[PDB]
A paper describes a structure:
Lipopolysaccharide (LPS) assembly at the surfaces-exposed leaflet of the bacterial outer membrane (OM) is mediated by the OM LPS translocon. An essential transmembrane β-barrel protein, [name], and a cognate lipoprotein, [name], translocate LPS selectively into the OM external leaflet via a poorly understood mechanism. Here, we characterize two additional translocon subunits, the lipoproteins [name] and LptY (formerly YedD). Whereas LptY binds and stabilizes the periplasmic [name] β-taco domain that functions as LPS receptor, [name] intercalates the lateral gate of the β-barrel domain, promoting its opening and access by LPS.
We refer to LptDE bound to both [name] and LptY as the LPS translocon “holo-complex”. Furthermore, we solved the structures of LptDE bound to either [name], LptY, or both proteins (holo-complex) at resolutions of 2.47, 2.62, and 2.63 Å, respectively. In these complexes, binding of [name], LptY, or both stabilized the β-taco domain, enabling its structural determination. The structurally resolved portion of [name] forms extensive contacts with the internal surface of the [name] β-barrel, particularly with residues located at the periplasmic-facing side of β1-β4, as well as with the β-taco/β-barrel hinge region preceding β1. In both LptDEM and LptDEMY structures, we resolved portions of the [name] lipid tails in positions proximal to the external surface of the [name] lateral gate. Notably, one of the acyl tails intercalates between the outward-facing side chains of β1 and β26. The cryo-EM density map revealed clear features corresponding to LptY adjacent to the [name] β-taco domain. Similarly, the holo-complex and the LptDEM complex showed an RMSD lower than 0.1 Å for the membrane-embedded portion of the translocon and an RMSD ranging from 0.1 to 0.8 Å for the β-taco domain. Henceforth we will name these distinct [name] conformations “contracted” state, as observed in the structure of LptDEY, and “extended” state, as observed in LptDEMY and LptDEM structures. Our comparison revealed that the pairing pattern of β1-β26 in the extended conformation (LptDEM and LptDEMY) superimposes well with that observed in the [name] structures of K. pneumoniae and S. flexneri.
Residue numbers in the entry:
A (entry chain D): 20 to 30
B (entry chain A): 25 to 43, 50 to 58, 73 to 76, 79 to 91, 102 to 765, 767 to 784
C (entry chain B): 19 to 171
Write the structure that this text describes.
Amino acid sequence: CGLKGPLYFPP
Amino acid sequence: ADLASQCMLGVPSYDRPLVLPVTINADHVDIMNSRLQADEVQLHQRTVDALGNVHYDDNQVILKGPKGWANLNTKDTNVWEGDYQMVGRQGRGKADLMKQRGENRYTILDNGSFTSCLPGSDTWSVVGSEIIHDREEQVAEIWNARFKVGPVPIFYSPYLQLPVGDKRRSGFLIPNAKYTTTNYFEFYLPYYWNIAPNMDATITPHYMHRRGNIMWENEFRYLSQAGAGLMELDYLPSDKVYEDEHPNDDSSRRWLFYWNHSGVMDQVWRFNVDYTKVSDPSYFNDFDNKYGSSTDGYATQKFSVGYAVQNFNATVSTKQFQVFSEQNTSSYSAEPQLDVNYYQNDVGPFDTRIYGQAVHFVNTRDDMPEATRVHLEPTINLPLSNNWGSINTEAKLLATHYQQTNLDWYNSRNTTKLDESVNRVMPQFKVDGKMVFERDMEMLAPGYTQTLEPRAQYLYVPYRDQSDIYNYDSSLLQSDYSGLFRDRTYGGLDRIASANQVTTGVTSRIYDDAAVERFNISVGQIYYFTESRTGDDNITWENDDKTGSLVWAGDTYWRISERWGLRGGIQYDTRLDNVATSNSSIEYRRDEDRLVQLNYRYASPEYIQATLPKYYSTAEQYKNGISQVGAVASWPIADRWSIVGAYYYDTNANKQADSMLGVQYSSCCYAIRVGYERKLNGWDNDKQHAVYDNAIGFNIELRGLSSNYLGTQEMLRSNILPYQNTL
Amino acid sequence: CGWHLRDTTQVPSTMKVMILDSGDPNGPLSRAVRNQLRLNGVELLDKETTRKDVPSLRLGKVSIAKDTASVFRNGQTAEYQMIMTVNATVLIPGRDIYPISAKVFRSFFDNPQMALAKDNEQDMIVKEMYDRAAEQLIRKLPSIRAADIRSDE
């Protein structure tokens, strides 16, 4: 199973 | 009381201060963040055995069972035959041997089981030959996993992972299903790919029973220096339904490509994409989709790049459209368009601006005209102002040049003929004056104030015969109340109508003793001194009226409280002998969860005849205009049910336009949603009546594993006439 | 009657000088807010000025949605409704922040065989919506001076 979320800049 | 509070009543808090010193207490047992309690302890030097009613608690878990063991130097631990309960997080379960390893990071469970359900409320559980909870990767790993609902296993695999926090992870998402009249049973199985912090994908096979094949839905999302965007590629290798309605064709593939991007970079470079393309006209009527809709007559294909700074901007763009209807196959595109603006304030008392455009117009048909157009528009204005009023004066030049090509076919069909080279130059003059009166209200309440705001505007634009320019980009604009003060009758540059008119209007506003605006009402009219002409004035109206007070519009807004709002507007046109369009809405909204909205939309049969394609006045599906009543509501029943619903009704047809009904039950341990929609989805030409599609959709979710927590606001936007908040 | 000419300015006298802060200073909302503030006689200062005595208007999220608002008897769009929402905040120096918002509604008829013309009409409408959002934020400024005085009393 997996889990999605908001994108963010590395780091 | 609220659901987050009901779920927290089943979740341990931490009773001690967050934190080394060590304490042992006994008859001659309680030991100390981490605490151990037992009837008996034996200590050796470093290790302990613990026995009888062994209880252990900590900053993240309670453990309980018959027997304990630990190494005090490494904080490694074994509890046999026990059960466990997470602290500040919802999970609990059993194991034949529960182990702490890697200085509290790894919690291992031999013959383990796990659930987010509160004690005794045992709805679902995982079972495995081994489970590992890892606190740094936010994951439970399970070997020989069985997933149980009640006592019965629904599923098995040799290995499984659950994510047990809010950190992203690749793998399958929970599936969903629906039943539709269009495809029968349908099933979706998303796989999520976590590529990087700033980009991800989802691959979703979408089975449709009627078609006997899987559509592959591929989503990609990204965040970048240039902006953020989303791409979607949906592909179906063949279609047994399509291959019967289009039986002679080479292949029955169906596909959709979508890309959207927006961004501003280094504060000056602007990037936008708004691109949709589909295999055939029928795509959005067959396939329910996140981006297109059965409501849509074309797909839009746009790109733009712009440079913008405080006093200057330049934008290059393309605008292409894929039109679904068979009724006309022609479609104009801008390929490219360049826009430029330059600003300079305080040029003496005057403010100055220049607008420039270059555009090339291309058509899908080989026989349609093509053009290049160049436009230049210097403007000078003199603003004057007071506490109680203002007056603005503008002058412009509307200089335009066309080169027109491919005219032979069009000039064979028409007596008015297009010209290969056209110059149009027009001076525009405008004067626009406002006042503001105030009055103390003795009548409504103490400290209230009423404002009265009269406007008047004069506009002069001279006549130029434009019938030798083809209309590539000029739609007739809708004259709403703010629209009474436009300098343009049309939306582009191919028609500029002569103007010799005074607009007059008045607004009144009511302000409370906190100086908040409670209410406003606006009324205005346009009085025309000469007929507004383009030389291509082939529009059709009920009356031969040309001059006088032809257009009226009004608008009101009442903010009755912080929960109640009333909006409405009306347009009346004397050339239609009738109200052209109207809309109104009343809303009550207490929460995201709790709202009711009633709305009404009117557009007359005469307005359709005057402003839309000429066959709309003949086709029964368009001919009668709009007279639509809508009701939208969301309410919670108990703290655990959300009921959402919308009904929309055509008052001329006495037929439903749209109806949606959504029920979500929300436990601490899981949620379920059922959603129904019935929509107008086309027309039957052989029988002369509307076609309806029904969909029933089933979504299911686990809870307590993540921060994700009554489904109301998502359901309210699932239908063809989606909710907008009007407070 | 009881009616008289408005005695005060549209902008509070304590907001005659102010700092306009935005994440998109060159964008279309920023231009409409610059334009209304200057038209009301406000003199704006740069974000990094030494003038820490003057208030700031801080422009935030803009959203534009376009939704089908009406359908013809075959379920095709008759009307689109466009809704613009603008969130902003005003900081009075050494005192609290006051959040404000504007909401603008516009609608237009679609036309599948003048689709490019209708896209130009949508660009036309969105430009006008930023002027209405800019007017609405400036009409909310007197309420902030009232909330300020009420927090003092």
